[PDB]
RNA sequence: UUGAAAAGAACUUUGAAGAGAGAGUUCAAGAGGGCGUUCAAACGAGAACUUUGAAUCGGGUUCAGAUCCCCGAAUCUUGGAAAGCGUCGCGGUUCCGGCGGCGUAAGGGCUGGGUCGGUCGGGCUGGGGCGCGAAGCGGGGCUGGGCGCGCGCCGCGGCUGGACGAGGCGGCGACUCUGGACGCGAGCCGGGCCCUUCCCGUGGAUCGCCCCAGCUGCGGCGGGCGUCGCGCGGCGCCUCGCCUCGGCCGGCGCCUAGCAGCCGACUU
RNA sequence: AACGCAGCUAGCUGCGAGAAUUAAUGUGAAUUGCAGGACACAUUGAUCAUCGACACUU
C-alpha cells in the first residue's frame, strides 16, 4: 500500500497540493508519454511537455494521427494548445481548444542542452533499477 | 544593454554612481511619458528601469558592507550591526569557552575516578 | 510714497544706484514725475510746463523714461 | 445639392490634375532617394514641390482651393504610416536595404488624390531583393490587385476584406487590425461607407454594412505586416492633424484660440503638419488642448516589433457606370522581389491570374463589345 | 438647451443677481456654447445678455404724504398710537430749552447787557422752570434792567 | 577666613563633564540620503488648468514628495534643469500628493523649460 | 455550485431602450452569467415636473481658489486716474476672447446792529515788454498736369491636358472641340510720387493783456430835457432812483420796551 | 497599528521610497485579464521555489 508515515493518503489534502501548487512543480504534473519507437532511441518513458515540440492527441474529440506541434503551454489552467487543433467560434474568428498533457503522445522531441540532462538523468536511473535483480 | 548584477561587481564606485544617476533620469522621463497618454513600449519599461535601479544599489551596498567586515575583523569592538544577530536570548547565552568551565575541585574528581566501561555477565 | 516738494533733491533721489525707473504723467493742469526706488515711489508734482520739458532733458542716462501721456 | 458629383467633365479633369501632379512628384521623389537622404528634407522637398506647382497652375483665378491635401509621410521598416518629422525631431539618415514608404496627397477644389508606395533603398540594377521583405511586399501588392479587381458595384466591404485575409495568410503575413480605406467626396477626405480589414468584434459589430454604388470615388490603403498585424504607437509624436468641422467648443486658453484661428485662416478641414507654423512651440501647446477636446483628429504614427517589415499601397479609384477605374498607381516593378511564398489558393490564383492579362489597355474591354453579336 | 451654467456666470460678470439677467430666447444656441467668462463678456457687448433695470419702488405715494404731514394733515387725535412721551421725549424738550436759554443768557454777558450779578442770578432762574420760552426770558430782562437802572436814578 | 559662605543655601557645585569619545561607532556606515533630487520631484502636471500657468503666469507645476519643503523644492528644480526659480508655493492635495507651483525667473521662460522636459 | 471545454450566444428583424422573434454553440439552454400657478418656444423618442421668455491692502483674474495667483502700493493732498464704474462709438466673430469718446397761533439758528476823511486789498491811466489771423519763413500732404504702376474689363493668337464619333474574324492607328497657362491689341478704367498750389508750426507790428511809473477811487444802470444814425446802436446834465468796491486807522458817528435780512426743523 | 508601492488596481494578498521586490543558490522555458519587453537556454537563464547576502518610511 503505502508504508510512509510522512506522505498522506488524504483526499482533500492531495487535491490542495494540486490545485494551488506552485508553477515549477506544476511543470512536471503536466507530463506526457512518448511513442513506442522513441522509448527505444532513448531509454525514457515520459517527459515534461515543452513549448514547441510535435505531439498528437490520442483520446477525445480531436483524436487523430496528425502530428501537430505544441504552440502554447498554459500551466495556470493545466492545458496545452495544438496548432491544427482549433475550433470555429460562432463569430467567425477561430480559437484553440486546450487538452490535457496526459492525453497526448510526443513523437518529436525539442532537444537542446537542458533536455539532454533530464533525458540522460532519467536514462541512467533505469539501468540502476536492473542491477537490483541479480 | 543588459544590466547584469554579477557584471557590475568588479567596478569602482564612480561608475556605479555614474550608471545609477542616469538610470534615475530615464525613470523620471517615463513618468513624464505616463501623464501624457504614453505607449506600452515606454510604460512596460518603468518596471525594467526600477528593478535595474534596485539592482545597481544592492551591488553598491553589498560591496560597501563587505569592506566594513574586512576592516573590523581583528577588533575588540565592532559596530552594533557588524556583530551577529541570531536572536536575543541566544546572545545572552554564555560563550563557548565559559559554557563548560570546571573548578579545580571538579577536574580532580574526574581525573581520579573516570567512568569505566564495565560489563556484567550472567 | 513720499512727495518731494523741491526739484533739486529730486535729481539726486533719481540718480541713486537703486532707482529703477521714471514714469512721467502729464495731467491737464500739471506734470507728475514718479521715480521708483527700492522702498519708495517718490513723486514730484510741478505745474510750470516750460520746466517739465527742461526736467525730462535733465535726467541721468541708463534710467528708464517711459512716459504715461 | 450644390456640390457637384463626377457627372461633369471638369470634375474628372481636376481628379486627373491632382493624380498626375501626385504621380509626377512621387516618381521624382522616389528617384531622388539614396542611402542617406534626410527624411525631414524629403518631407520639405515634397511639400515644396506641391506648393511650387500649385503656385504654377490656375493662378488667374484667385479663389480656387488647391494644394497640399495630405502631407508627405516617409516611414521606415518597422514603422507603419504617417511619419512626417519635425525640426526638433530626430531624423533618420537612410541606408542600403531599408523599406521606405512614401505617402502624399493633393487636392483641387475640394477633390482629393492620395497615393502611397513601398520599396527598398538602393537595391542595385543587377542585384535583387529576397526574403521576408519580398514576402510582405508581394503580399501587399497582391492585396492591392485584389482590391483593384474585387471592388465592383454591388459588393460589400466583406468580400475584399476576407480575400485580403486569404492573400496575406497565403503569404503567411497579416493585415493590421482596424484600418479604414476611405470614401472621398467634395472637401470630405473621409465619409462613412469605407473598407475595414481584420476587425475586432466591437469594431465589426459597429461597422455598418454597405454596398459599392455608382459615381463613387474611393481611396484604398493596404498595410500588410510581416509579423502579427497588431500595430500600436510607441510614444512617437503625432505631427499630422485634421480639423473636424461639426465640433463646436470655445477654447479657454489664448494660445489654442490663436492656433485654431490660424488653422481656419490657412486650411479649412484639410490635413496638415506642424512644420508649417515654424514657431512650433506655441503650436504644440495649443494642439494639446485642441486634440483633447476633439477639435483635431490626429494621424497617429504606429510601429511594430523590432525586425518587422510592413508594406503599404494606397491608390484612389473612380466608379463610372463602366465600373471602377484606376487613376493613380505607385511606380512598382513586381519582378525584383523574389518571394518563395505566394498565394496558393487555386480559385484565388485564377482570380488574381485573370486580371494580369487584363491590364493591357483600357479600351480593349469596350472594343470587343461590338464583336459580341458578330458571330 | 439647459442654461443653468450660463445664467450663473452672467450674474457674476454683471455683478448682479440672477433675477436681473436676461438671456435672449431667440439666439439660444449662441448663448448655450459659452463655457467661460470672456465668452460671456463677448455676448454682453454684442447685446444678447442684458442686465435688466431695477424694479420700481417709487416714493411718490409716500412723499406727497410727507408734504402733507409736514403741514399736519394726518396727525389728529386718532392717528397717533404712542404716548406723548414716546412720540417726542420730554427729556429732550428740557434738554433743548436749557440749550436755548443758557446760550442766549450767555449772549448777554459778553455783549454787556447784563452784569455777572444778574447773570448768575438769572441762570438759576432758568434752571427752576421760571421762563417758559425765549420771548419770555428776553423781555423779563428788559423790565428787570429798567427798574435796576432806575435804582441808579 | 578662607572657607567662607555668605550664601545661606548649599547649592550643588559644578563638576566637570567630559564629552563622548567612544571606542567604536554605533552604526556601521552613515546612511545614504534617500530624499535626494531625483526623489523630490515625481512628475509634472499636464492638466488644462495647469496650462493657464506656463504662458499666462510663467510657472511650472510639479508633483513633489510630501516630505519636501520649499527650499528642497527650489534646490531641486535648479539642480535638475540648470534654471532659476523665483518663488515656490505648495498645497497638499486631497488625493494625498503635494502640488508645487514653482515659478521661474523672469529672465527665463517656462514655455521653453517645458520644451526640454516634454509636457509641451 | 454554468458547462468537458466559453465553444458566453455571429448574422437578420421590431423597439430609443430594457426586452423580444428566427439563427447559431452544446449530448443538453427543460445548463443563458446568483446559470446542476398660467401661457408660448426649444432639446428630446418621450414634457404637469427640465431650460429660456412673459404675467496687508487696492484692482484684475477661474468651469471650480483667492486679503494666498498676477499687477501695483506698502510694513485736503502723495497712492490718484494711467485703476474702477456709468454711457457712447468703431473693428471683429474660437487671432477677433481687441480699442477710443465724454462723465464721475406758539416753539429756532446765522450775519451786519451806522456818519465822514487818512492807510491798504485795490479799481484806473501813461512809457516799455508778452500772445497772434495776415504779408512772410521751415515746410507735411485727399488738390490742378506728367511717369513706372493694377500683373484688370473686353476681344484675338499659339502651345498643352481632357473628352468624343468611327472600325476590324484577343489586335491598333488616323480626324475635331474645349479647359489650364502665356503672349498680344494701353480699346477701357483704379492706386502712389515731383512744381506753384491746399494745408499747419515760429519771430516782429495792430489788436487783447502784463511789468515799471501816477491817486485811494473806478467801472456801470434808470426817468425828464437834447434827440443823430451806418443787424448794430449811441450821447451830456439833475435825480426825493443808484451800487457810493471793500477792510484798518482817525475829527468823525451811538440800536438801548431791540431791529433788518437770510436760512431751518419737526411738533402741540 | 498607520500610511505608501502594479502599465491598466478598488478588496484580499505580498512588500517598504531597492517598495506584488534586489542579490545569491537550485530549477530550466515561461507569466497571463489585456498589452509590452526580455529570454543563443553555455558569451548564462523566463519562471517558480528556497533564503544564508543587502535593504527595511511613521
Numbering used by the authors:
A (entry chain LY): 1 to 134
B (entry chain Lh): 2 to 123
C (entry chain Lk): 2 to 70
D (entry chain A): 7 to 381
E (entry chain LR): 2 to 154
F (entry chain LX): 37 to 156
Any passages from the paper?
The ErbB3 receptor-binding protein (Ebp1, 394 residues) is a highly conserved, widely expressed, and multifunctional eukaryotic protein. First described as part of the ErbB3 receptor pathway, it has been further on identified as an IRES-trans-acting factor (ITAF45) initiating viral mRNA translation. Ebp1 is MetAP-2 like and mainly distinguished from the MetAPs by the missing catalytic activity, a shorter N-terminus (~150 residues missing) and a C-terminal extension of about 50 residues harboring a highly positive charged patch including six consecutive lysine residues.
To gain insights into Ebp1 binding to the human 80S ribosome, we used cryo-EM single-particle analysis, and determined the structure of full-length Ebp1 (p48 isoform) in complex with puromycin-treated 80S ribosomes purified from HeLa cells. The MetAP fold of Ebp1 as determined by X-ray structure analysis binds to the 80S ribosome as a rigid body (root-mean-square deviation (rmsd) for 352 Cα-atoms of 1.0 Å) and thus the model could be directly fitted into the cryo-EM density (real-space correlation coefficient (cc) of 64%). Ebp1 binds with its concave surface, harboring the active site in MetAPs, directly on top of the ribosomal tunnel exit and is sandwiched between the exit and ES27L. Ebp1 establishes contacts with ribosomal components all around the inner ring of the tunnel exit, including proteins eL19, uL23, uL24, and uL29 as well as the 5.8S rRNA (helix 24) and the 28S rRNA (helices H24, H47, H53, and H59). In the human Ebp1–ribosome complex, ES27L is resolved in the exit position and the ES27L-B-arm (370 nucleotides, 2912–3281) reaches over the 60S tunnel exit as previously only observed for 80S complexes from yeast. The ES27L-B exit position is stabilized by an extensive contact of 1000 Å2 with Ebp1 (overall Ebp1–ribosome interaction surface: 2500 Å2) and an additional smaller contact with eL38. The ES27L-B model allows for the definition of three specific Ebp1–ES27L contacts. In our cryo-EM reconstruction, the C-terminus of Ebp1 is resolved and projects toward the widened major groove, where it forms an α helix (αC) with the highly basic lysine cluster (S363RKTQKKKKKKASKTAENA381, helical region in italics, side chains not traceable) that entirely fills the groove. In the Ebp1–ribosome complex, docking of the insert domain of Ebp1 to uL23 constitutes the largest interface to the inner tunnel exit ring (500 Å2).
